[PDB]
């Protein structure tokens with residue numbers, strides 16, 4: 029058995045991806061090789077991939093896509109790329125054409141879960157509660173269906189990149205410009221405040237099993253990039269201090285969304301809890317995978333050790 | 348400016364894909380090379396691609412995927428593949444990773460328009476009419492809230508494969524079994540009967556322009572009847588406009604790029620959007636091209652616009 033782990037990527041989450049790879053590479057219970065996609069899109073293989081991992085960032089790569097990799101040597105490919113060109117169905121599509129089994133969601137589910145506009149449309153249709161929002165296209169005059177404050181974001185982003193809180197309409201233009209640096213489509217959501225952030229892990233193909241629910245607490249105005257990756261800045265409460273009904277509703281909604289979207293392998297489902305009301309914020313098909321990341325910790329609290337979690341992910345990819 | 352046209356594919360529409368390629372090569376106003384995906388998945392390049400084209404069918408290819416193709420020699424790629432591994436976002440993903448501009452819908456829009464379950468969920472939430480349906484997952488017995496007749500279909504196999512018209516609930520189990528041999532998810536749609544089928548073309552990136560509306564009609568069988576692409580469709584004034592407006596709304600909501608042939612059902616005065624084809628048939632006599640020609644957009648000009656849109 030041999031697994032190919034791909035990390036890095038051209039998205040803003042390149043460094044976060046390499047961090048996830050470090051954690052996975054240390055506990056994955058299978059012979060595994062690492063391939064790195066540099067920020068310039070060129071791949072780094074073998075020892076150069078390991079050298080990049082140790083550097084924590086690979087600006088330049090050697091091989092133009094597609095890389096001269098002996099794909100036949102791998103039983104499963106574990107795409108550990110976060111964000112566009114990795115978690116959005118693009119890499120998945122390549123793997124489908126290659127006929128290679130891989131970890132995580134397929135093309136449709138990956139593309140849909142990454143889009144903060146379309147995912148909300150599908151979930152709402154299924155009766156899942158979501159935050160009021162509207163999509164805005166670059167070059168299209170914005171007409172927000174509700175008053176501020178808002179959270180403006182690239183429709184496809186991660187690690188809070190390109191996201192900002194907007195208090196007045198006159199500040200919307202600049203917030204959208206920032207979002208458009210990352211995507212041609214942005215979303216403007218009604219800002220919930222105060223808000224509690226709950227996250228739950230799901231494991232399995234389509235019909236999943238839920239981990240305990242966790243909660244994120246911090247002092248910053250919102251769960252931004254520095255708060256997300258600065259160890260100890262955020263507080264992860266596992267399990268989250270929720271009453272039984274709310275805990276169960278979070279887990280049930282997560283499994284429902286997971287099934288409707290047809291997610292395979294895994295997903296960390298994040299929610300907002302405000303004034304006793306729950307909202308499914310987003311599903312993450314390739315959640316941060318450091319041993320300390322939320323998804324791994326969640327399942328650890330659920331009796332599934334890090335090595336065992338990775339084993340199951342690989343096995344699910346083969347069924 | 349040099350364009351790369353990819354046609355053929357491993358789907359059942361391999362032959363029609365080559366016919367579309369033939370039509371495109373004949374009128375595309377840019378230097379263009381052809382690459383063919385044989386029915387076995389291997390690629391044929393250079394002269395062998397042209398040989399396959401003239402043969403109208405390429406059973407076996409030479410190069411296993413990914414092919415040793417000089418991508419840098421092309422400014423735009425035109426994936427003229429239909430169905431599975433063509434309109435589902437897979438080839439689009441490969442082209443995205445290659446960093447090559449390409450004609451038509453991107454990964455998300457392609458994958459979504461392909462899925463007869465998810466596309467309906469999106470459209471229904473946006474207020475676009477679609478027929479009543481239920482999504483069914485392999486291994487999980489379905490609960491259909493409406494009565495037969497039904498049209499059971501794999502959710503993402505495409506190419507009319509595995510689609511059955513069911514008239515009795517007792518025949519549902521079998522119909523589903525058939526659909527599930529092609530996809531892990533199927534849909535059970537309320538069958539409209541009688542029903543008329545209308546089609547309209549859209550061109551542009553996200554904010555498109557609609558062509559006139561056409562109707563797919565069949566003539567009486569003799570010793571089944573032929574199918575005419577009647578342009579324009581004989582409809583009341585408001586109806587044509589509604590068809591165009593719904594097509595443009597669906598197009599924008601799904602974020603489609605380049606083009607789409609949007610197919611509708613008309614029954615008892617009610618419209619239902621059945622499908623957005625992101626890579627429609629493209630021969631000189633195909634519905635999409637003829638619709639825009641009726642709209643004042645000549646075939647060569649249509650091809651030019653699709654190539655230019657791919658760059659913006």
Ligand SMILES: Nc1ncnc2c1ncn2[C@@H]1O[C@H](COP(=O)(O)OP(=O)(O)O)[C@@H](O)[C@H]1O
Pocket residue numbers: 159179181185186187188189191217218219220221223225250251252298309310
């Ligand atoms: N509608 C909202 N109301 C309140 N806070 C929000 C809202 N949307 C986003 N946020 C804040 O921004 C953070 C990131 O938003 P998110 O959509 O999860 O982007 P990302 O996919 O990068 O994690 C959230 O964890 C939350 O703290």
Ligand SMILES: Nc1ncnc2c1ncn2[C@@H]1O[C@H](COP(=O)(O)OP(=O)(O)O)[C@@H](O)[C@H]1O
Pocket residue numbers: 478498500505506507508510536537538539540542544612621622
């Ligand atoms: N809900 C329905 N009611 C009536 N006829 C239908 C329905 N769904 C499909 N059909 C018939 O089957 C044909 C193909 O349906 P479609 O889903 O578009 O298959 P394909 O994926 O091959 O294009 C339609 O053109 C129509 O004649």
Ligand SMILES: [Mg+2]
Pocket residue numbers: 185186187310311312
């Ligand atoms: Mg996310």
Ligand SMILES: [Mg+2]
Pocket residue numbers: 298310
């Ligand atoms: Mg988040």
Ligand SMILES: [Mg+2]
Pocket residue numbers: 430434461505506622624
């Ligand atoms: Mg189709």
Ligand SMILES: [Mg+2]
Pocket residue numbers: 610622
């Ligand atoms: Mg159709």
